[PDB]
Ligand SMILES: C[C@H](Cc1nc(=O)c2cnn(-c3ccccc3Cl)c2[nH]1)C(F)(F)F
């Protein structure tokens with residue numbers, strides 16, 4: 001069960017995603033669907049809802065970073081944004097359903113090695129998706145194979161036309177998570193910002209791509225205590241890759257290279273050239289987002305810069 | 320064993336594809352690869368190249384239209400164009416290898432039901448490819464599945480950098496055969512066309528995309544009875560899809576409805592609004608195309624228009 005305290009904190013981006021076990025996370029995800037009025041407006045069989053969440057969980061891999069806790073993390077942040085930015089006043093329920101469901105399924109069956117590995121290693125994935133966002137494509141397919149089994153199909157009671165609309169929206173959002181397209185997408189969105197139109201369908205599609213992108217890389221928005229472990233879990237996975245990459249001939253990226261990257265320098269670059277700019281333009285649309293999320297981001301940047309001095313200082317010694 | 324008479328008619332769009340058998344065509348294909356000096360300039364092992372073309376032939380299905388012969392026509396037409404338009408003076412042997420390989424592989428393992436059926440019926444392909452060019456994506460995938468085996472890999476003797484550029488090219492061409500992108504591709508082309516530039520890598524990519532598109536739907540460019548049978552084979556496959564759709568209760572395209580489609584009306588629109596316009600544009604770059612390909616297309620159009628009059632009169636005589 002969840003205490004009214006937990007259920008209360010579940011709305012803030014300060015929620016401690018580490019305090020829980022799969023079962024307790026499944027319950028929170030479940031709470032979110034009810035509380036958002038999704039179970040209600042889509043006639044989601046409450047039993048199916050919980051069975052779906054179990055099948056989703058079952059399909060996430062036990063990786064150091066790209067795992068079910070990450071999934072929950074992204075979904076929970078998305079949930080926070082819905083209340084923080086009062087999204088239910090700008091988005092239809094079908095839009096919210098898409099944001100939430102896409103967030104929960106965006107990394108289904110992730111293997112721990114990104115697209116670059118897949119393509120360079122000429123993997124069965126990279127071959128099947130002709131080197132086009134192979135991971136993202138795969139997550140999305142698994143997401144719909146799951147929804148294909150009537151028992152997990154939380155969309156049973158939605159008419160075919162509504163299903164089509166929801167499916168197309170989820171695919172757009174999940175593929176939009178591939179960071180390779182980060183600049184392209186930010187340009188498109190900033191271009192629409194010059195005069196945003198909440199009634200312009202294309203304007204909203206980009207805003208939704210931006211929102212799920214925000215949640216998927218929002219770790220640094222959370223409290224320093226909650227955020228740090230994630231950076232280490234990602235680098236574990238990244239090293240796991242660059243290890244296998246160098247011992248296979250396949251090239252390696254600087255940010256995944258032991259001899260080149262450091263938690264601090266990395267996060268200073270990520271926070272300044274990715275996270276703060278992105279959340280900056282989003283603030284022009286949502287002012288409350290500046291205090292609640294752009295603040296910890298600045299703080300986080302500042303802190304990793306102070307940690308950079310000490311890191312460099314220790315480096316001098318081991319030389 | 321091709322005679323010298325054959326090796327000569329094989330460079331023209333008047334070649335009768337309906338004569339030869341799988342065995343013989345496989346020879347013509349093999350010939351084309353040597354004749355174009357792809358073996359030479361790339362170091363293709365003449366034995367591997369012969370196995371590969373067999374690996375390929377096996378992977379095509381026994382469909383009335385989308386079968387190994389269609390494959391043959393597309394590559395044979397592509398071959399005719401390399402000679403007619405002297406493409407070896409404009410394109411590198413790399414691009415020529417891409418164009419020919421792409422043409423041969425473009426419909427690998429086609430099931431006989433188009434993307435609309437896949438999408439509407441929510442097939443594995445549709446689910447797997449997220450409704451995005453599911454058939455074409457699958458073809459290009461089965462293509463590289465074959466080049467994956469060490470025994471069919473006709474690219475084995477190519478540096479890493481080389482294989483990359485080839486693969487990307489092939490993915491681009493095969494994915495460009497999806498008619499759903501016709502208007503989009505024709506536009507990008509007609510644009511670059513306002514000031515073509517055989518130097519501009521993007522100008523050339525669009526030309527290669529337009530070249531394979533021409534070859535994929537170029538049946539009407541051939542002689543009246545080499546062409547006519549093809550229209551029949553396509554409808555046999557189409558009616559095969561609509562019968563199954565009606566049965567399964569899925570929507571039916573008009574041009575696949577026995578009570579609506581007539582060869583006459585069909586080929587009139589297709590020739591006037593799809594074929595002729597595309598070749599006219601290509602003729603701006605290669606004037607010699609007008610006499611060898613536009614000519615038969617204009618005759619095809621007129622013939623079909625005359626054929627529709629007959630059909631109107633004939634039917635009026637019955638009501
Ligand atoms: C090199 C990474 C930088 C980085 N910082 C994050 O906070 C963060 C959040 N998500 N991702 C991420 C994860 C997977 C793929 C792409 C990204 Cl972007 C991140 N990557 C790190 F130093 F290890 F942190």
Ligand SMILES: C[C@H](Cc1nc(=O)c2cnn(-c3ccccc3Cl)c2[nH]1)C(F)(F)F
Nearest residue numbers: 498535536538539550553554574585586589
């Ligand atoms: C309804 C079709 C129209 C048509 N005419 C062709 O000559 C032609 C050549 N290729 N394709 C074709 C085949 C498969 C998919 C798309 C196209 Cl475009 C054709 N489609 C037919 F009148 F029945 F023929």
Ligand SMILES: [Mg+2]
Nearest residue numbers: 106107135177
């Ligand atoms: Mg991902």
Ligand SMILES: [Mg+2]
Nearest residue numbers: 425426429496
């Ligand atoms: Mg095709």
Ligand SMILES: [Zn+2]
Nearest residue numbers: 070106107216
């Ligand atoms: Zn993710």
Ligand SMILES: [Zn+2]
Nearest residue numbers: 389425426535
């Ligand atoms: Zn074809």
